[PDB]
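Long-time lurker, finally posting.

We've been working with Golgi resident protein GCP60 (Homo sapiens) and I want a structural starting point before designing mutants. I don't trust myself to interpret raw outputs, so I'm hoping someone here can both generate the structure tokens and explain anything notable. Sequence follows.
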Amino acid sequence: PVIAAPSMWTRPQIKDFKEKIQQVITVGRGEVVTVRVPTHEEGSYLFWEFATDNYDIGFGVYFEWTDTAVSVLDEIVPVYRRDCHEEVYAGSHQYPGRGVYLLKFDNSYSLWRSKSVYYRVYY
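Top reply, 14 upvotes:
Generated this for you. Predicted structure of Golgi resident protein GCP60:
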């Protein structure tokens, strides 16, 4: 089981990222949204970008060995609170093999606030 280290960065241009995203996920007050993004035999990589309005949210990535679902295994990125309300959080990961990626928008730590998740998955 060979797992490539993922790469992660940020971008300042969040207003505009959001703006052309809107042309969007509501994560509940204490819920967890799981976007399942199956691999490609044609692509080699997963690219992702996401941002939120006003409040941070937990982000994490896992790999489900199984052959886009959006719902309410091996670890790529651990699930941590991320300031994707101030900047756009982006990342890549090399396919480990074939399967489905688990993008985890975790708002379970929130008690009163829902989150608006603007995201993108590429190529």
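Before you design anything, note these points.
The two ends are 24 Å apart (CA to CA).
The chain has one domain: 1-123.
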